[PDB]
From a paper:
To facilitate soluble protein expression, a PUUV Gn construct (residues 29−383) was truncated by ∼120 residues prior to the C-terminal transmembrane helix and transiently expressed in HEK293S cells. The crystal structure of PUUV Gn was determined to 2.3 Å resolution using the single-wavelength anomalous diffraction (SAD) method. PUUV Gn forms an α/β fold (∼40 kDa), consisting of five α helices, a 310 helix, and twenty-two β strands. The β strands assemble to form five β sheets, which associate together by the formation of a β sandwich. The two molecules of PUUV Gn present in the crystal asymmetric unit are almost identical, with differences being limited to solvent-accessible loops (0.7 Å root mean square deviation in equivalent Cα positions over 327 residues). For both molecules in the asymmetric unit, three loops (residues 92−102, 204−208, and 292−300) were not clearly visible in the electron density, and it is likely that these residues are either naturally flexible or require an associated protein, such as neighboring Gn/Gc protomers, to impose order. No higher order oligomerization was detected from the crystallographic packing, supporting the hypothesis that the Gc glycoprotein and/or C-terminal regions of the Gn may, in part, be required for tetramer formation (Hepojoki et al., 2010). The PUUV Gn fold is stabilized by seven intra-domain disulfide bonds, a pattern well-conserved among hantaviruses. The PUUV Gn sequence exhibits N-linked glycosylation sequons at Asn142, Asn357, and Asn409 (which was not included in the crystallized construct). Electron density was observed at both Asn142 and Asn357, with the glycans extending away from the protein surface.
Numbering used by the authors: 27 to 91, 102 to 203, 209 to 291, 301 to 381
């Protein structure tokens, strides 16, 4: 039994906050990954979006005798954290709970990371409940916070700044973000990879057309944070940490550079990365930055290219976990 801890605040407050928790489970063989279904015995209202079938290009490597053979094909996965637009943003109002997983994989095995997001009211209704994923049971524990006004962060009770203007103590908090595909008809407002390129590039990249955004939750509970929100200091912070740690923040053995075709029907290579063996470390899921219409990739045993300074064959991860410093008061 794994443990997914939810830190519950003393009050609901302004209504629009969500709780979030997550746990990384033990390795399962690859052949079992396509069968994985999240089950819930919990007394909450599961959003059905994530358990539908979702098309991915599977990209894999084998030793050959540069010394690699890669290949790819299109498959359907279910239960992954591909959250539709507005679902997280309006979950406090709809009273919907999002439960989904990401995959961190080597060639032969995957560690699912289960994410649970939902309304703060769940803390009134629920002390503990169970999720299942394949053969693993997950104990969700809702636990009331030691603090009076904030959250337990690095063993310290902390409340961040709230005002919209400019004016403190500084505490480093966890941020968890989910990639959302969202197109507009006209212009470049949703061209997410262009935002990264302005932050970390010298010269002009021609074709990074992916349209979407990240939706993030800060700490154990917060209102959703949209990335990018141009004049928000927290958005700026998350983007900068993403730009320097594109596979998130926290033995794996690097073998070499690999390329491949995504989707597999492409005549030439559209993706690159670094093949590895040993313990999976980063998530193995992302989207090509080059296509407006998302091309989703699952690349077990390969760290797909996420360096924003590169122009071609790069990706954005489906989920991203890191840390940002927040100004506020320790109490
Ligand atoms: C992908 O990652 C997975 C998980 O990280 C990894 O598979 C695991 O590898 C370890 C070690 O390579 C396996 O450990 C074995 O566990 C059994 C359980 O009873 C032990 O009995 C074994 O012990 C013997 O082997 C050791 C070899 O050094 C000795 O020190 C020891 O005294 C024993 O003789 C053994 O350690 C584990 O079972 C698997 N896990 C899974 C889920 O299959 C895998 O190697 C990674 N894949 C790649 C391609 O890198
Ligand atoms: C991210 O990508 C850029 C461009 O490929 C890499 O920048 C080069 O890095 C080498 C060694 O650090 C330098 O000698 C080159 O002059 C750099 N070129 C440019 C255009 O900046 C960068 O190292 C990559 N970051 C990684 C792999 O972490």
């Amino acid at each position: 039994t794994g443990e997914l801890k939810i830190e519950c605040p003393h009050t609901i407050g302004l209504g629009q906050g969500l709780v979030i928790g997550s746990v990384e489970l033990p390795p399962v063989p690859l052949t079992q990954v396509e069968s994985l279904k999240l089950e819930s015995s919990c007394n909450f209202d599961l959003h059905t979006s994530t358990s539908s079938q979702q098309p991915f290009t599977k990209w894999t490597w084998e030793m050959k005798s540069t010394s690699f053979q890669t290949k790819s094909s299109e498959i359907n996965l279910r239960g992954l954290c591909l959250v539709p637009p507005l679902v997280i943003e309006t979950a406090a109002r709809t009273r919907k709970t999002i439960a989904c997983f990401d995959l961190s994989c080597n060639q032969t095995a995957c560690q699912p990371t289960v994410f649970l997001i939902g309304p703060i009211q769940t803390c009134i209704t629920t002390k503990s409940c169970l999720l299942g994923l394949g053969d693993q049971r997950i104990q969700v524990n809702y636990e009331k916070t030691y603090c009076v006004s904030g959250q337990l962060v690095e063993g310290v009770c902390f409340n961040p700044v709230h005002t919209m203007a400019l004016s403190y103590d500084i505490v480093t908090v966890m941020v968890r973000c989910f990639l959302i595909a969202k197109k507009v008809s006209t212009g470049d407002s949703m061209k997410l990879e262009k935002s990264f390129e302005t932050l970390v590039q010298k010269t002009s990249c021609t074709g990074n057309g992916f349209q979407g955004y990240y939706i993030c939750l800060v700490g154990s509970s917060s209102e959703p944070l949209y990335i990018p929100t141009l004049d928000d200091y927290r958005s700026a912070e998350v983007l900068s940490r993403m730009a320097f740690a594109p596979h998130g923040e926290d033995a794996m053995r690097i073998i070499g550079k690999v390329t491949g075709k995504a989707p597999s029907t492409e005549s030439s290579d559209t993706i690159q990365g670094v093949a590895f063996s040993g313990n999976p470390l980063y998530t193995s899921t992302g989207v090509l930055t080059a296509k407006d219409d998302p091309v989703y990739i699952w690349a077990p045993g390969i760290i797909m290219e996420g360096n924003h300074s590169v122009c071609d064959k790069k990706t954005l991860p489906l989920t991203w976990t890191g840390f940002i410093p927040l100004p506020g008061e320790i109490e």
